[PDB]
Structure 1
Amino acid sequence: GSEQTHRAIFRFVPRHEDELELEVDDPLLVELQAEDYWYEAYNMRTGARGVFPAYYAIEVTK
């Protein structure tokens, strides 16, 4: 979809090229699964895309 799917809960500052920087409460759009325990997403606040540790975000209320 095009709507927010997750919200970051921990600050994440990249050290690697493919990573997505996160600020607490950052809205995230995740569209694929993980397996690696890493999520690939679009940060709706910064407009950047990349991966981050899966447990650094929570699915938006259901």
Structure 2
Amino acid sequence: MEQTHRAIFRFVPRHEDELELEVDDPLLLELQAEDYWYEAYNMRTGARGVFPAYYAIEVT
């Protein structure tokens, strides 16, 4: 169960459900929801939460 996605933009949470992203954070994406929020594990911070879909790219 390794990285599915990589953060490409800085995201600072405003809401308690959100996942903080730094550029190049490795992400394990558990759910790509119909409202364009991704539920993920940040593999750098160990935090879980949601972020806006366009903040990450799919990795090989």
TM-score range with shorter-chain normalisation? over 0.9
Shift of 1:31: 1.9
In structure 2, the gaps of 5 or more residues are: none
Question: Which one has the bigger strand percentage?
Answer: 2
Number of aligned residue pairs: give it: 59
Shift of 1:32: 1.9
Q: CA RMSD in A?
A: 0.7
Q: Secondary structure at the match of 2:32?
A: coil
Shift of 1:33: 2.5
Instruction: Give the whole-Å Cα distance in 1 for the aligned partners of 2:21 and 2:12.
Output: 7
User: Percent of aligned pairs with the same residue?
Assistant: 98
Moved over 3 A (4+): none
Instruction: Give the whole-Å Cα distance in 1 for the aligned partners of 2:19 and 2:4.
Output: 16
In structure 1, the gaps of 5 or more residues are: none
